[PDB]
Structure formats: C-alpha cells, structure tokens
From Swiss-Prot, chain A:
The chain holds residues 1 to 51 of 401 of the full protein. It comes from Enterobacteria phage N4 (Bacteriophage N4). It is found in: Virion. This is Major capsid protein. Assembles, to form an icosahedral capsid with a T=9 symmetry, about 60 nm in diameter, and consisting of 535 capsid proteins. Coiled coil: none annotated. Transmembrane segments: none annotated.
UniProtKB/Swiss-Prot annotation, chain B:
Forms the portal vertex of the capsid. This portal plays critical roles in head assembly, genome packaging, neck/tail attachment, and genome ejection. The portal protein multimerizes as a single ring-shaped homododecamer arranged around a central channel. Disulfide bonds: none annotated. The chain holds residues 3 to 51 of 763 of the full protein. It comes from the Viruses. Transmembrane segments: none annotated. Signal peptide: none annotated. This is Probable portal protein. It is found in: Virion. It comes from Enterobacteria phage N4 (Bacteriophage N4). Homododecamer.
C-alpha cells in the first residue's frame, strides 16, 4: 500500500526509494511581513535656516 | 496674542470633511508633500542669493 | 510627583515671560454629557506618565483630566491628544525619552515608582513634560557642496 507517511521528521514515503525525497514539502506565501516607520512629532515643528 | 506655529500637527484623518469626494486629501498629506519638496528648493535658492 | 499647583505655577511663569498662546477656548456643544474646555497651551508627555495625570485632583477635590471623548464634538482634536488638564492640552508622544537612573537611590520603601540599575545601586527614573513655545528654535542645514541637503 503506497502510503505518504511523513517526509519530514524522518519517515520516507512509500514510492520513494533508497536515494530520493519529495522535492516540495511546503508552500511559500512570498508576501513578507514588514513593520512601518515610527511616527515623529518634533521634526515638523522646526524650520530650517541655511548656512 | 494667539499664534499657532508649534501646534502638534493638524487634525488626524478622522475629523471633518469639506467635499463629497470618496477620497479626500486632508492636511497631513499636503504638509508631507511640502516637507518632502522643501529640501531641493532650499538648495536651489542659495544660488539665487 | 507632578501636582496641580505645579501646573498652575508653570502657567503663571509662562504668562509672565510673555509667551504667546497656541490655541483657543472651546465652548460647549449641544450633545448630552459634554463639558467645555478652557485650555490655551500644548504640553508633550511620555506614554508612562499618563496614568498619574489621570489620577490628579484639582483644588476642590474633583476630576482634573477631561478626556477627548467629552469635547471631541465642537472642537479640533490634534494628533495624539489624550485629554486636557487645567490650561494644557496633553499630547502623548510615543518616542518620548527619559533619563535613566538619575534620581536618588531607591530603598525597600519604594511605593511603586520606576527605578533602574546604576553601578549595582537602584536609582529612580526622571521623566520630562515639555512645552515648546512659539519661535523658540530653528534647525541649521549645511550646504554639503551641491547635495540636496538632508
């Protein structure tokens, strides 16, 4: 009986042989999780005079 | 003497709406554009001076 | 710990030094449970101080922290505003710094205020509450020889 078993955690699938393993064992979202710039309050207050 | 030159920014996004547009610019966006454009203008005015 | 009379003294000092005001008073709205605000200055405080400001009582023993929810109508809510005390409208700057381990040493009678380690000895933490008046300072930007400044 060809069983999937669990390719990760050390238990090969039935169909695989002595030298092989599943090529794809997970899926990748490709949308990273990122933060944002922390807001600043004092900077807009000041003007600027060139030198 | 009432001067507002150091007030911590105008109202946030949730305040009052002047127009009926679905997307309204609000004052923060305009002031952000101004502060983004000012550094180049400041460098330019030196040559005129 | 900051107290009401300290806020009144700061108002008196700023009035004597001719510092211009920054806002206007707020007359009440028509909605029920809405109270007027008389406050003409802006003060920037850190995030940790807000509970102490909320717990304050005025001279006659009433509340002294009117939250923005009461007077949001018929007013102009600024960014980060959390309420109004006396004459100062409160602004909660997320990034507000503080000196660490700058107070006197802390023994085991600490009622609960924050402390920090300095050379193996406890010291209290000093926090700022700042008011920036009109035309106090300007920034300087050197030319950098052709670069677009900044």
């Amino acid at each position: 009986m060809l069983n999937y078993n669990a390719p990760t955690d050390g238990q090969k699938s039935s169909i695989d042989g002595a030298n092989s393993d599943q090529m794809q064992t997970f899926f990748w979202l490709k949308k990273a999780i990122i933060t944002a710039r922390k807001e600043q309050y004092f900077m807009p207050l000041a003007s600027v005079t060139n030198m | 003497q009432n001067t507002d030159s150091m007030v911590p920014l105008p109202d946030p996004s949730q305040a009052t709406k002047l127009t009926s547009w679905k997307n309204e610019l609000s004052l923060q966006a305009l002031k952000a554009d101004l502060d983004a454009a000012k550094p180049s203008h400041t460098a330019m005015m030196i040559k005129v001076k | 710990v900051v107290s009401y009379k300290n806020l009144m003294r700061l108002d008196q000092i700023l009035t004597e030094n001719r510092t211009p005001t920054q806002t206007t008073i707020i007359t009440g709205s028509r909605m029920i449970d809405t109270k007027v605000i008389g406050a003409t200055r802006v003060m920037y405080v850190g995030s940790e101080l807000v509970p102490e400001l909320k717990a304050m009582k005025d001279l006659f023993g009433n509340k002294a922290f009117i939250e923005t929810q009461h007077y949001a109508d018929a007013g102009t809510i600024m960014n980060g505003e959390v309420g109004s005390i006396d004459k100062f409208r409160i602004i909660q700057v997320p990034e507000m710094l503080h000196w660490a381990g700058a107070g006197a040493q802390a023994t085991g009678a600490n009622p609960g205020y924050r402390t920090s380690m300095v050379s193996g000895q406890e010291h209290y933490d000093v926090y700022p509450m700042l008011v920036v008046g009109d035309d106090s300072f300007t920034s300087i930007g050197f030319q950098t020889d052709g670069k677009s400044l900044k």
